[PDB]
């Protein structure tokens, strides 16, 4: 509930600055807006790929840290350590 709320807020932010910055460089906007162009399932998948150190995800570090902490608390609760 709160993780997705923060994710939606940060994706609101990023898109707002991309839209206010599209004028200064129109060419980059075509590649930059594929995230918002993608279907919502693909958007979630690509925005949730920050696992490991590949880090291609356009996700803020705090939002990454929240999920990286919940995912280790869950493993401790599931006895996977």
């Amino acid at each position: 509930d709160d993780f997705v709320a923060k994710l939606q807020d940060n994706q609101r932010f990023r898109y707002n600055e991309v839209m206010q910055a599209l004028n200064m460089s129109a060419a980059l906007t075509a590649r930059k807006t594929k995230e918002f162009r993608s279907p919502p399932q693909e958007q979630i998948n690509m925005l949730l790929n920050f696992k490991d150190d590949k880090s291609e995800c356009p996700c803020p570090e705090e939002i990454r840290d929240q999920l990286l902490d919940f995912h280790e608390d869950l493993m401790t609760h599931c006895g996977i350590e």
């Binding site: 898109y15 918002f36 993608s38 958007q43």
Partner: peptide, 19 residues
Amino acid sequence: VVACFRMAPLYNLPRHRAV
């Protein structure tokens, strides 16, 4: 082009759908 860019907004998606 704004409409085609804005199709499928995961921030305009309702909370439960996003969850």
